[PDB]
Design a protein around this ligand. Sequence first.
Ligand SMILES: Nc1nc2c(ncn2[C@@H]2O[C@H](COP(=O)(O)OP(=O)(O)OP(=O)(O)O)[C@@H](O)[C@H]2O)c(=O)[nH]1
Ligand SMILES: Nc1nc2c(ncn2[C@@H]2O[C@H](COP(=O)(O)OP(=O)(O)OP(=O)(O)O)[C@@H](O)[C@H]2O)c(=O)[nH]1
Ligand SMILES: [Mg+2]
Ligand SMILES: [Mg+2]
Lengths: 417, 431, 241
Amino acid sequence: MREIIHISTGQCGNQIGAAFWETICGEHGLDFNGTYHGHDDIQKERLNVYFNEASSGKWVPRSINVDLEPGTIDAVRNSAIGNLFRPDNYIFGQSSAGNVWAKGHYTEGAELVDSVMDVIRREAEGCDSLQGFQITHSLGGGTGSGMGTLLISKIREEFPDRMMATFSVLPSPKTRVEPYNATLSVHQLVEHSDETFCIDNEALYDICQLKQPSYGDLNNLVSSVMSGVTTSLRYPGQLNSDLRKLAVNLVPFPRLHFFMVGYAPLTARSLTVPELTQQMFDAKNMMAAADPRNGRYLTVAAFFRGKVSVKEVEDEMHKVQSKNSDYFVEWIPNNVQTAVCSVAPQGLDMAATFIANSTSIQELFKRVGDQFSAMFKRKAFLHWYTSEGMDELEFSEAESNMNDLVSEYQQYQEATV
Amino acid sequence: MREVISINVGQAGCQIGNACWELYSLEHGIKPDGHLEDGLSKPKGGEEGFSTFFHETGYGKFVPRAIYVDLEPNVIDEVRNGPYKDLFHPEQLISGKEDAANNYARGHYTVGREILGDVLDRIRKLADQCDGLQGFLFTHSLGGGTGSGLGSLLLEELSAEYGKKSKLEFAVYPAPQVSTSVVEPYNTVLTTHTTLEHADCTFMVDNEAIYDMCKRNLDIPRPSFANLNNLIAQVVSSVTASLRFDGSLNVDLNEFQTNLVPYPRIHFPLVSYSPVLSKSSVSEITNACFEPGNQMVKCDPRDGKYMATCLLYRGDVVTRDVQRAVEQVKNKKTVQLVDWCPTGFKIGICYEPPTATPNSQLATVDRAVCMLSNTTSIAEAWKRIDRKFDLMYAKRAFVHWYVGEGMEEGEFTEAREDLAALERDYIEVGA
Amino acid sequence: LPEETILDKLPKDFQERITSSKWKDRVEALEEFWDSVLSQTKKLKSTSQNYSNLLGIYGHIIQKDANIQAVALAAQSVELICDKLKTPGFSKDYVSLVFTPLLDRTKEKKPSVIEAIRKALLTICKYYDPLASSGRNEDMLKDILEHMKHKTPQIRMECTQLFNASMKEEKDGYSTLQRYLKDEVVPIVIQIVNDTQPAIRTIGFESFAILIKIFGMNTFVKTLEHLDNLKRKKIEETVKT
Ligand SMILES: Nc1nc2c(ncn2[C@@H]2O[C@H](COP(=O)(O)OP(=O)(O)OP(=O)(O)O)[C@@H](O)[C@H]2O)c(=O)[nH]1
Ligand SMILES: Nc1nc2c(ncn2[C@@H]2O[C@H](COP(=O)(O)OP(=O)(O)OP(=O)(O)O)[C@@H](O)[C@H]2O)c(=O)[nH]1
Ligand SMILES: [Mg+2]
Ligand SMILES: [Mg+2]
């Protein structure tokens, strides 16, 4: 049945995870009690991918909510979406990772890993044919970043051949140790992640600033994307039905699996397919502080939803590919996979989601690497990390590793013939 | 009777299989029950070639001699739940739990190797019910993971366990208009390599050709797989017509080899079909087979040279009109025929009229023709996929997926060198 | 070279500290005893000195503790004790306390932690050859081999590499290796050679190449012909190296 086990790590991961579940709940025609009230069959077909059928007929998310601190997890508890969540799928410690990667990856986080691992093992046992895991977290914090990347590695040790998708929120210059946490996590993602959707918190803020937004306003934006990103996974289906098919199509090289994401429409009367398409590829619609025009597209997985003709979408996507042929590498025939789904979001007529493996994402890492090197050269804040069990060479590793990532992304930008 | 077992692998093979067996069942007056239509007594085909493809149980039911194989239950579940759920025995439909994910490696080395035991078992069970098993019809895609990996794996084993039995392959060549993956050129080259020696005759089906045919002839702005399969099933039906009914040529899986292939490697005939008309004469359809827009593979038949040929006519046909049409092609000169071919064109007639399903967009025709020609212009198909392959492989793009699934990276080279050889052997034999 | 004692030099609160829920207590307890004692040790006294508890504690930390720093420390201490106690001091009773935990924790990836585990494993195997012609250490051989079938690809790599080391460094016959050959070694080696990941397939090639160098190219000829032509050629090429 190709089930997916969701894991929400940290305050960010749990609030984005909540918004996500709260969003896809509606698209599948589900109450917040788990009962199905949809008026279509498409909503019920691939329903068990993310949801578990409780004997009562209700549908419970296959989610595991993890946080070293009981703060945010208690907020999700007595929320609307907190009703259908399985009580014993709430994992929480007494301490906190104090916004340092070390406390999450080696110390306090390392002590809670085995308790969550038990629950995912119980979930995985109740899967007809588990396909992989999906993780929501912030790379800027301590729990989501540190314990998340720890959990990823420990998950691969026990499930070597299951897919590993990640929704990672990058921090923006806006909490003084985020370049450390982020760089240390990216080093883990490049080694132990099959798919990483980079959600720059700067881009979310900029876009919401629709006309200062709160985290909730950002989360709706994130939740809208994730819904769109996972349209191929939650509806049948033809293109990129599995996490695996998607990875094969989006990943030309092993350590180049960090994807930009574009979404449309945003705005603050109905659009045309060309407008929806042009808006999608727009740099103002990218969920990452990086202009796609400064790089090349290695691959693309465009997902359209709603009342649209398959032909009109394909004709338009092809027209864009021909016109902007310079922004696509020539040594990969048919970079862009275009899918279409009848089920629209709510409340919209049509929408388009845009997963890209653009080389311009090097601007994201290159930006953090500068903030990382700025601090590291002064040996700043290291005490808070090395007192937990880390060494300086671990920082230098993550730095040079992320540098090699930029060099790699740049290397294929220039590739000829 | 000389039975023929039809094996289908992957989504394309199984969906094409559905369209084929739906048409077969109509052309022989058999309902989706497996029972005969109202007031028939016996199926239209036999007593003759009907038992070739169907099996009579003894209690008034007729079962297709077919095997569906896929590494995901999705496509086959549509068969298990569809209106033809009773046509096939539940044992004939085999499904896994996780697919090959557009990857030839996990279809050949990893996941496809898990189901292989079951398939070969059902095949043996089906083969044991045959008084004289003639061979196999292998239908699959070369762009998929299960169609390519498990498919070539199955041909390899079939050659081993059934060495004296022939195998005709129906390979779906990938097209960008309906592509499902970026690494389809990889899978296609690999499959060609590992099946170049485990198939007596291979009929290539370029989806780009069928797509354009549905778009031009039938006037469909965006044909679905269902549109493609309806046309494909019409061609496959025409080819297997001589076997399933009374024919004067290609009435044997072995006669395809004899009449079309000069050397073992040169076993890739170019198929042509006419007429293709929407619901909305012999001389004309015969001449249409030698024009660019009537082939199953995107190419210009007027280019390259013909080495062998088999014109298979169907329906209301009189030998006079075809004898005229054939000499018309020779005399006024579309030759373009190699100087070392002794007897030129071989003719075949099957008076059974061609049939189109009601749930389709194809018009019922009085007479139709299908030409099977071993021409060198089919090398264009391999040339086009070769440029796709080389562009990506020059950068080792996506290769880590294959090498990461038990395959040795060397096989990319050996397979490409083999396809380059197949190309050379074709332009060289046309000389 | 005088012989020393170390059991009378533990922190008087070691037992409570090492068994503390606080990670810092366990790490400090180990690190203290290492710096103040085990590091400055050159020779140990086995006479009227029982290390069972201490090694049992270490072995427990190595197997079940989550804090990899404490794991690295325990493995370093076990390696110190074993090398400085030597044989027949470090008995098989002591080996059984720490060998399986180490084999289980080869799953670790962190360079400093896995280096400690490897050193400990190699030191114990140095004094106790798993392939001994006496056949006394076959229990350890079964342990390695059973771990070369582990679900975790990292453990398969580390243990198969350990197994290869035992084969290479063997210089006292191969009678113990011949018995387990066709029924235990080869069936496992084939799984390694045919693994999905190329990093593991390489280790397999090395293993088969070593087996070929020892028992000859001929005795496996029926087995090699079953592999892929390219996997077979890889081994053929590796044998030359
Ligand atoms: N987009 C978005 N980002 C968030 C949200 N909440 C937190 N973040 C980001 O997360 C980063 C810090 O990590 P947090 O998620 O706050 O907390 P944590 O990672 O679990 O670390 P702990 O404090 O130990 O719990 C900040 O830089 C924020 O930008 C949110 O609701 N939406
Ligand atoms: N003519 C035709 N071609 C098809 C059909 N379905 C898929 N294809 C083609 O097959 C190729 C992909 O392979 P699949 O059909 O998915 O075969 P598969 O082995 O099941 O692929 P996996 O997903 O890896 O299991 C694409 O290039 C399609 O063009 C079909 O119904 N008819
Ligand atoms: Mg927090
Ligand atoms: Mg399929």
